[PDB]
């Protein structure tokens, strides 16, 4: 029932799949929502953080 | 306020496109900007591996600029504590740039499209383009070999980029009602 | 329901003789159950002396009624009338653009009301546009007992014409134009700075962007006034904006070279935000003033307080007599005057300085105002040259230790911007005058309180002009 | 859809720069990106689900006021009022005629404007056709 309720419904912290998922307070909204491509979020991982307050120029520099 | 919006929007995305751990660590120094560090750990109780990869991330997206807590010891000694003073402009600012990458990763993709221009030859797995296709062509051969391979070419970038950008789309769309429309949210007086 | 049984008993003779002030007339019409706004406008057709607001002499959509019973030749008083150059000033129109968007959507639900009722009962819109095609429609246009929906901004239903609008005869073709017009005006809203616009400069300008003609431009408050008339809408809030675009319509098609357009892109107090003001303003009082003023050479005039003579002439460059300045005769002291250039320190006290701190006069003032607060009986007032200006002495003062110790004397009571909380605060001040303890009122000279209220012996012994 | 590209949703949030253009086909919101992209080439579709207008870039143009039934209207009285500029009030003088030729060629227009019907229109624009003979004539 942690996981039948998954995507946030029911929320829980997997310490491991070997130790019973030893859980902490979670509930969410979405929470997980793993169908996002992980390359894609690893293309979202792969966006580096360029400096300081330059990068309020960067992202108006990007076009944000 | 907003800044709750601001505090709700991190969640989304720790959420939206992050795992449910990810926000553990956020509502636990939501509660208290000048958190000791082992609160957390100790009301979580779980180990520093279970805990180290999530701090790497709140610091990887600078959401958790952990003050280092300085307190006045009672034995006259190093005192701190990692407090996240969360640095709510700075964290959104490289976020929005963020967002803006992966739409270059599409924005770029546009130009990766529908409609077959190049070409290739399977037999040496290498693309072509129309001009060199033209430019290789034949008044005997009307279609086109391959200088290394003398072979035939084959079209490419019709159905899977089309396919394939469209996808990304719906990605780009699954942030529209999400962060970037909260992202505005914030725009409106940009705290 | 008083107008039907008003309409009843009292249109035909007046209630019997009295000059029923609002003390008499309220209740009085209460009792025979009615509602004396038409008693009086009724009324207007009888009684020998009127007295109304000078707009209702001045502002012509009010001032429009005027019939020679009530005007022709008889004699004109203009009371307290040292500020009427700003009240002509009546032909002020700011354009809250915000509003204009509810009047976009307003119009469309004109658009929509006019096209669904053409779907369903257009015979008598085309008997109206035969209404229409006869000419002018003086049955209708102008005579309507109960219905007249747009009121005339233009001078007391004056400056008008008669050849029809043309096409837009057709409402179908008078819609259509409208939307050109805000869109033009919507168009005309983002302008990136300020910007003060002429109406014949802007009047081609207008046919420039979208071929408008200004012969049609006027004629919209009456089509609309008749087009709103044959489709008894449920509300006007949307429909004032409309007729306000008609208004300003009619004002822009109107009048030239007295009066000019300007578009600020926003409000500079709060600069940098989108706000603009299309503000198309009358210049010359005169110009307002001319029609009535051109009716009656037994025109009289006087205030209190008009100071100089010349201005009024000059600046409404109109024909007096004799204007003479009459020394109040007097016995004895009567009263005290006094100018307080400096204080104690003789520093010079001022306001065009700024509208900010400079300590020295401030933490200066406050003395000047607690001995003073100290001396007299009950019965203060203090004036302020602009709101939030006072509102910096005060947050200074009270951050001060000044207040509490006139708070020790005296009662305090600041004016408002809102005038309901203001009218209750200042029945308090009265009482606190009237009763024994010491009281004291500050307000704003170019406030509502300085232009009606009146200040008697207990409820006034001392005046001060920060 | 109210600031973002109906074809790629670019907000005009995520594009400020968004420059949105129209044609006179179709009249579609859309952004520039896409409208070069689409028409780089030359004559095809208008990239809309439902919409099979061969159109081209060069046609393209920019909206003034939004309001594609002003605007088409607007652009029926700019085609109006450049053949139809051909109309007699001031030319004719009559002020009923001068209102009645101002109304029907308003009501010309209308009938292509009102559009609710727009074959009289159609009639009309042979009448348009005509009047490309009539302001021809
Ligand atoms: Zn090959
Ligand atoms: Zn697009």
Redesign the interface.
């Given at each position: 029932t942690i996981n039948q309720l998954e995507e946030d419904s029911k929320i829980l912290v997997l310490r491991t799949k070997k130790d019973k998922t030893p859980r902490y307070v979670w509930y969410n909204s979405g929470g997980n929502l793993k169908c996002i491509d992980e390359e894609f979020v690893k293309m979202w991982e792969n966006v580096q953080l360029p400096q300081f307050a330059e990068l309020p120029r960067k992202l108006q520099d990007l076009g944000l | 306020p907003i800044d709750d919006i601001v505090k709700n929007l991190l969640?989304?995305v720790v959420?939206?496109?992050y795992?449910?751990?990810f926000?553990?660590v956020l509502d636990a120094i939501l509660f208290h900007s000048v958190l000791a560090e082992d609160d957390l750990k100790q009301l979580?109780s779980?180990?520093k591996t279970?805990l180290g990869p999530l701090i790497a991330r709140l610091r990887?997206?600078?959401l958790i600029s952990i003050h280092k807590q300085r307190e006045y010891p009672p034995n006259s000694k190093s005192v701190e504590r990692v407090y996240y003073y969360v640095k709510y402009?700075?964290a959104i600012?490289?976020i929005?740039?963020?967002?803006?990458?992966?739409?270059?990763?599409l924005?770029d993709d546009?130009?990766k499209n529908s409609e077959p221009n190049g070409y290739m030859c399977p037999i040496c797995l290498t693309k072509y383009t129309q001009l060199e296709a033209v430019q290789l062509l034949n008044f005997d051969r009307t279609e086109f070999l391959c200088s290394l391979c003398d072979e035939p070419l084959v079209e490419d970038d019709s159905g899977k980029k089309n396919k394939e950008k469209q996808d990304?789309?719906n990605?780009?769309?699954?942030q529209?009602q999400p962060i970037?429309?909260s992202?505005?949210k914030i725009?409106d007086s940009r705290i | 329901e008083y107008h039907e049984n008003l309409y009843n008993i009292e249109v035909e003779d007046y209630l019997p003789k009295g000059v029923f002030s609002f003390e008499k007339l309220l209740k009085y019409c209460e009792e025979k159950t009615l509602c004396p706004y038409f008693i009086v406008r009724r009324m207007i057709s009888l009684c020998n002396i009127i007295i109304y607001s000078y707009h209702y002499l001045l502002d012509p959509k009010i001032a429009e009624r005027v019939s020679n019973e009530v005007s022709k030749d008889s004699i004109v008083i203009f009371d307290e009338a040292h500020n009427i150059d700003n009240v002509c000033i009546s032909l002020s129109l700011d354009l809250t653009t915000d509003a204009l968007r509810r009047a976009t959507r307003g119009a469309n639900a004109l658009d929509e009301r006019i096209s669904e009722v053409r779907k369903v009962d257009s015979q008598k819109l085309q008997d109206e546009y035969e209404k229409l095609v006869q000419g002018l429609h003086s049955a209708d246009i102008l005579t309507d007992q109960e219905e007249p929906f747009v009121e005339t901004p233009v001078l007391p239903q004056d400056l008008l014409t008669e050849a029809i609008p043309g096409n837009i005869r057709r409402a179908e073709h008078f819609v259509s134009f409208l939307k050109r017009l805000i869109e033009y005006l919507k168009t005309r809203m983002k302008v990136l700075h300020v910007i003060s616009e002429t109406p014949k400069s802007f009047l081609q300008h207008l046919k420039q962007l979208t071929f408008i003609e200004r012969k049609p431009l006027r004629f919209c408050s009456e089509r609309l006034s008749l087009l709103v008339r044959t489709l008894e809408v449920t509300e006007v809030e949307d429909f004032t904006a409309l007729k306000d675009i008609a208004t300003f319509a009619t004002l822009i098609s109107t009048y030239e070279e007295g009066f000019l357009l300007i578009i600020e892109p926003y409000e500079i107090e709060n600069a940098a935000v989108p706000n603009p003001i299309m503000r198309f303003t009358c210049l010359d009082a005169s110009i307002a003033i001319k029609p009535v003023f051109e009716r009656f050479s037994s025109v009289i005039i006087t205030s209190g307080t008009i100071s100089p003579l010349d201005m009024y002439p000059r600046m409404l460059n109109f024909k007096t007599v004799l204007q003479k300045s009459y020394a109040m005769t007097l016995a004895k002291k009567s009263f005290l005057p006094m100018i307080i250039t400096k204080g104690s320190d003789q520093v010079a006290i001022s306001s065009r300085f700024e509208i900010r701190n400079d300590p020295s006069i401030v933490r200066n003032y406050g003395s000047m105002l607690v001995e003073f607060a100290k001396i007299t009986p009950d019965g203060m007032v203090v004036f302020f040259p602009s709101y939030l200006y006072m509102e910096s002495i005060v947050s200074m003062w009270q951050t001060m230790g000044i207040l509490d110790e006139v708070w020790k004397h005296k009662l305090i009571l600041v004016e408002t911007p809102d005038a309901q909380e203001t009218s209750l605060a200042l029945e308090t001040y009265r009482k606190a005058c009237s009763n024994g303890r010491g009281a004291i009122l500050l307000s704003v000279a170019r406030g509502k309180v300085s232009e009606g209220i009146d200040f008697d012996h207990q409820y006034g012994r001392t005046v001060l002009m920060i | 859809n109210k600031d973002m590209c109906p074809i790629c949703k670019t907000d005009r949030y995520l594009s400020p720069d968004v420059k949105f253009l129209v044609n006179p086909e179709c009249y579609h919101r859309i952004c520039e990106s896409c409208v070069d992209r689409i028409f780089s080439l030359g004559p095809a579709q208008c990239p809309y689900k439902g919409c099979d207008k061969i159109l081209r870039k060069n046609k393209f143009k920019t909206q003034i006021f939004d309001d594609v039934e002003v605007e088409k209207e607007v652009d029926i009285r700019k085609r109006v009022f450049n053949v139809f500029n051909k109309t007699i009030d001031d030319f004719n003088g009559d002020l009923v005629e001068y209102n009645k030729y101002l109304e029907e060629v308003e009501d010309i227009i209308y009938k292509l404007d009102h559009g609710i019907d727009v074959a009289k229109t159609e009639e009309k624009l042979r009448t348009y056709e005509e009047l490309n003979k009539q302001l021809i004539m």
């Open positions: - | 969640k989304f959420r939206g496109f795992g449910g751990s926000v553990l979580l779980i180990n279970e990887s997206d600078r402009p700075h600012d490289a929005k740039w963020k967002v803006h990458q992966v739409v270059q990763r924005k546009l130009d990304k789309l990605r780009l769309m699954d529209i970037i429309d992202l505005k725009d | - | -």
